Amino acid sequence: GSMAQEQTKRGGGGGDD
Amino acid sequence: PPSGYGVLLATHDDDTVDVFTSGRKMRLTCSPNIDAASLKKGQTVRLNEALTVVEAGTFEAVGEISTLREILADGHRALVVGHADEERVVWLADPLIPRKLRPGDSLLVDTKAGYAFERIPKAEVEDLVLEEVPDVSYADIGGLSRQIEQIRDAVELPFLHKELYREYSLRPPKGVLLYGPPGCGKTLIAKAVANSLAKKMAEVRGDDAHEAKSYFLNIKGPELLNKFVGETERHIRLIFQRAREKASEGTPVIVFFDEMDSIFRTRGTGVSSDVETTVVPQLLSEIDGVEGLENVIVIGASNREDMIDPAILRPGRLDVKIKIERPDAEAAQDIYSKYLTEFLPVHADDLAEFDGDRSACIKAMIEKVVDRMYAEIDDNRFLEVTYANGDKEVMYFKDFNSGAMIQNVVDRAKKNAIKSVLETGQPGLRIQHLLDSIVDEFAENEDLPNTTNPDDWARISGKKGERIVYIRTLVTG
Amino acid sequence: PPSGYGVLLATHDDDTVDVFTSGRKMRLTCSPNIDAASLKKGQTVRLNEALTVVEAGTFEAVGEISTLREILADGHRALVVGHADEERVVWLADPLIPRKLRPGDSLLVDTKAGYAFERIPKAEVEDLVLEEVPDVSYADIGGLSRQIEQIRDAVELPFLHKELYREYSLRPPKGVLLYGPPGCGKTLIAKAVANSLAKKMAEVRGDDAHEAKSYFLNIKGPELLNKFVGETERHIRLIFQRAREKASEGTPVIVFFDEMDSIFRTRGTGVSSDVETTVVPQLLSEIDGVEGLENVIVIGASNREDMIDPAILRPGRLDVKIKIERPDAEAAQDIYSKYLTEFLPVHADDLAEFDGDRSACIKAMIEKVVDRMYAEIDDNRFLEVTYANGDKEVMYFKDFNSGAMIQNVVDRAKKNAIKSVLETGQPGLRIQHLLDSIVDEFAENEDLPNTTNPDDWARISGKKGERIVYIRTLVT
Numbered sequence A: 001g002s003m004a005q006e007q008t009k010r011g012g013g014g015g016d017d
Numbered sequence B: 001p002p003s004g005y006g007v008l009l010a011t012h013d014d015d016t017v018d019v020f021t022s023g024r025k026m027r028l029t030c031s032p033n034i035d036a037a038s039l040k041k042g043q044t045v046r047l048n049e050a051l052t053v054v055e056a057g058t059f060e061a062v063g064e065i066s067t068l069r070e071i072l073a074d075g076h077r078a079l080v081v082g083h084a085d086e087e088r089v090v091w092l093a094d095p096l097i098p099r100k101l102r103p104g105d106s107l108l109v110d111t112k113a114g115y116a117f118e119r120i121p122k123a124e125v126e127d128l129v130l131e132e133v134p135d136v137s138y139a140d141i142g143g144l145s146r147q148i149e150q151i152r153d154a155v156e157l158p159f160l161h162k163e164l165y166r167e168y169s170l171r172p173p174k175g176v177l178l179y180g181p182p183g184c185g186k187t188l189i190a191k192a193v194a195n196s197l198a199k200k201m202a203e204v205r206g207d208d209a210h211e212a213k214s215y216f217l218n219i220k221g222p223e224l225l226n227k228f229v230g231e232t233e234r235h236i237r238l239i240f241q242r243a244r245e246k247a248s249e250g251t252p253v254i255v256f257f258d259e260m261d262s263i264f265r266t267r268g269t270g271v272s273s274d275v276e277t278t279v280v281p282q283l284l285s286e287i288d289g290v291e292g293l294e295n296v297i298v299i300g301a302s303n304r305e306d307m308i309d310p311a312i313l314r315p316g317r318l319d320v321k322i323k324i325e326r327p328d329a330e331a332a333q334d335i336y337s338k339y340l341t342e343f344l345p346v347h348a349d350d351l352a353e354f355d356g357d358r359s360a361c362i363k364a365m366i367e368k369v370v371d372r373m374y375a376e377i378d379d380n381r382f383l384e385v386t387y388a389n390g391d392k393e394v395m396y397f398k399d400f401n402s403g404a405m406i407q408n409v410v411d412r413a414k415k416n417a418i419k420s421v422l423e424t425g426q427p428g429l430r431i432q433h434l435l436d437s438i439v440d441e442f443a444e445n446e447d448l449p450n451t452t453n454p455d456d457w458a459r460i461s462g463k464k465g466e467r468i469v470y471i472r473t474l475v476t477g
Numbered sequence C: 001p002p003s004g005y006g007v008l009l010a011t012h013d014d015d016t017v018d019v020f021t022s023g024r025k026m027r028l029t030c031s032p033n034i035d036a037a038s039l040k041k042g043q044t045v046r047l048n049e050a051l052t053v054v055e056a057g058t059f060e061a062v063g064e065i066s067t068l069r070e071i072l073a074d075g076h077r078a079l080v081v082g083h084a085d086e087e088r089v090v091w092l093a094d095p096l097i098p099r100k101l102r103p104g105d106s107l108l109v110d111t112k113a114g115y116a117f118e119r120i121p122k123a124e125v126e127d128l129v130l131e132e133v134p135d136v137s138y139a140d141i142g143g144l145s146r147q148i149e150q151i152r153d154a155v156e157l158p159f160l161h162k163e164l165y166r167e168y169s170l171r172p173p174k175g176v177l178l179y180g181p182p183g184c185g186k187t188l189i190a191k192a193v194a195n196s197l198a199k200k201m202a203e204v205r206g207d208d209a210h211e212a213k214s215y216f217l218n219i220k221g222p223e224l225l226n227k228f229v230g231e232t233e234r235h236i237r238l239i240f241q242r243a244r245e246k247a248s249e250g251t252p253v254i255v256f257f258d259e260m261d262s263i264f265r266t267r268g269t270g271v272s273s274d275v276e277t278t279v280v281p282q283l284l285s286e287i288d289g290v291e292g293l294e295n296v297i298v299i300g301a302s303n304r305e306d307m308i309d310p311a312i313l314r315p316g317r318l319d320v321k322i323k324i325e326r327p328d329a330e331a332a333q334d335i336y337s338k339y340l341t342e343f344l345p346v347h348a349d350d351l352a353e354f355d356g357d358r359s360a361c362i363k364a365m366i367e368k369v370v371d372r373m374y375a376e377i378d379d380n381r382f383l384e385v386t387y388a389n390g391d392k393e394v395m396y397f398k399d400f401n402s403g404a405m406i407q408n409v410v411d412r413a414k415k416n417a418i419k420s421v422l423e424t425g426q427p428g429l430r431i432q433h434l435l436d437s438i439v440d441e442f443a444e445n446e447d448l449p450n451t452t453n454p455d456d457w458a459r460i461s462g463k464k465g466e467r468i469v470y471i472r473t474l475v476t
């Protein structure tokens, strides 16, 4: 059970004005 | 006479300047009452109904804070990001051309005009590194006179005498490694150094309050670990950049890596974990890299120096090695004197033998307790170590003394004295209480040893020359 | 005095110019003072309440920046994507229609006007690492002459004689590796080559410091690793694009990777994370691929030669693998000469025997101290390396020596001299101080080795044929 790091993936957001 | 406000953009030789007003750039002249040459870029100026400059004000505005990315080559513009990942190029104001601007620092900017008026320092703040100033000083530490002198020469001496070092062309040390057995006292020296630095920053220079807190950035081993790829390196770079920017000429900034042994293990060791092969290279690159530290001292305390990576222990990164040794009889006497002060209540019967002489009574009690701990009797026989040849070496409790153990003995004696006060009503402290505390502690530490224990082979087998193959607990009960 | 401003859009034969102003496009007449022939698209102009163009000006310098997406066929327009994934077709102004506006370039643009002007990325932060050029040159490095000759032949020589290389159809080496034990002087060469390159750029092209420093990049190691997937590879691609742009077949760009093992591995040694499994192929493609770096040199420094991926350690990528060995007696003498300068104060006791001849006295002291430290006496015995064969070997402190240790010894001697002059008042470094510093240093670095150390013992174990099973410190 070796500890492992992570890399996340962003999700686009919808913003107006 | 209603007078408006606008933002100055640039100056021209025609005594006329460009001002952003009402959302548009207008080229307008200056009234004779105000000098156009004295004006500066990014200045809030006053206007009127005839569109003429009448007054120039401070660089005060309300604007969004944008993270600085990079200054342009021409040195007048910088790239910043926004909340919506919006990148913009903005002219730097007069005060921002003052400490050097660095990436990752928030700048107050108005996107409509695109001017960064000032930099907000508290937006990029780290409270984890800051540590509360301890009360412990050098006078509160005993039995380590040589180590204290060595660390003083390593840290305080170069900054007190800078002209002589410049004359001899000598640079201050770029790292100190305090190492040793558990309980012998390493955090205490760090507290004393931090307190001395706090005093130097408070009274010698007199800058302001909280300035002492700013120096001596303290971080523990596990604190740097994060759950991501290439995030601990970001912390290392940020803390080293903060230390570099805060330090000045003759100004010492000390970074303490307490519990150095757990983190920064030797690369290639440890099947379960692999964070070392990333954290250690960053530290090796930050210290003694292509661009080196100027006035930064890195202090590392570790109970397992052997476990630390060999690349960081070499000279140039950790130059001054200070080993803390277990106290001897004189060191034990000094440590006891550091705790059994004259302000502790003494029983009248205790002072009877010396006609109320508190100092002599305390000195005699300290001598008695030191003799009791440093007597080779069947009571103090702790373990026997048998090597391959079969010879047995008897190790007593004296070989396992520590300042923490002495403090615990004193505290247990005080607790027993208070119990006696509550039960029998007789106030004061008794030497027999100290003797009973000694017996209790040495009986309690009987079950600690195991088949193999650390911190003893490296100091025993070297002189003996024989590998330790068995350790036996001595007479029980 | 009150005069407006606007943005030029296009010109006509009617002595009329289209100007965008106040959020609207108009057509206006130029004043007789200004000639419409010299006007270019995107130039900023000054207006008035009479709405007449009076004077042209430089292009806009600030605003939002938008990554370029593609270049249209006509060449006067290009598609660019905004920050929030909005795409617009915008004209290309005069300065962009120098280096081609290649796709993938965040162009400075005005959305309302619809015109482009400039660009840049975050890889420049690497250039910010070397804000101060080190002053150490090749004259300050001692004990290494063949290595300095090789590193000069790899970098300075190809650009010193272009015609000879062209005649022999020989290209400059694509990459250089420097490897050796810690403290042997890899970073010294790494910063000396950068100093030399900065001097060359200052003396040849221009006296500006920023442009001279712009030709050396300092990676610092794991700085490339990022939180999000595919961003570190993009950073590497941007770095190599920046490197290829500055090259002109006569100006080298040196990208220095420090601690090569940090980000490069054998793609299987990664246990906790395998980011290198994606990072390595990107760099391999960047170095050699369908399109190859013509005039870019990559210099890597590491302490673990074998741990690097075999693909990187290949001819055609890392052509010359310079090995830096631990100093011998001659190298120690050279280092001491480089450190014990003639101008250091010296006690009159030392000068009494040599009639005050500072140089001869210092040379004699250096020889005496190097002889003292390079002595095979029982007091210098450090470790006993054993093997399965049984050929026990006694190692001395001289074996574990480096320039860093010599510098530390000199610093300790200087500290002892300063303490002596503070306490007693007689200045001058003494010979006995160096001997005391040597023995104190060898005592301080005694209990360093761990149970097993693959640092430099692997080579000796391979030489003897058997593996190490036990080592002990032989002191007292």
Ligand SMILES: Nc1ncnc2c1ncn2[C@@H]1O[C@H](COP(=O)(O)OP(=O)(O)OP(=O)(O)O)[C@@H](O)[C@H]1O
Residues within 6 Å of the ligand: B140, B141, B142, B143, B144, B181, B182, B183, B184, B185, B186, B187, B188, B189, B301, B302, B303, B335, B338, B402, B403, B404, B405, B407
């Ligand atoms: N002169 C002294 N020498 C040793 N210990 C002392 C001395 N004076 C006081 N002590 C006490 O010893 C205790 C332990 O000290 P310290 O916390 O420095 O050990 P440590 O270095 O943290 O050990 P480790 O690093 O192995 O945990 C302290 O609580 C302190 O009160």
Ligand SMILES: Nc1ncnc2c1ncn2[C@@H]1O[C@H](COP(=O)(O)OP(=O)(O)OP(=O)(O)O)[C@@H](O)[C@H]1O
Residues within 6 Å of the ligand: B284, B288, B311, B316, C140, C141, C142, C143, C144, C180, C181, C182, C183, C184, C185, C186, C187, C188, C189, C302, C303, C335, C338, C402, C403, C404, C405, C407
């Ligand atoms: N001729 C020399 N050979 C080796 N070291 C030298 C020499 N002259 C001076 N030194 C000193 O040695 C120190 C270490 O050199 P350097 O920084 O190049 O090693 P390094 O690349 O950091 O090693 P590693 O990367 O393995 O830690 C320098 O601070 C320098 O002052």
Ligand SMILES: [Mg+2]
Residues within 6 Å of the ligand: B186, B187, B259
């Ligand atoms: Mg501690």
Ligand SMILES: [Mg+2]
Residues within 6 Å of the ligand: B288, B289, C186, C187
């Ligand atoms: Mg190095």
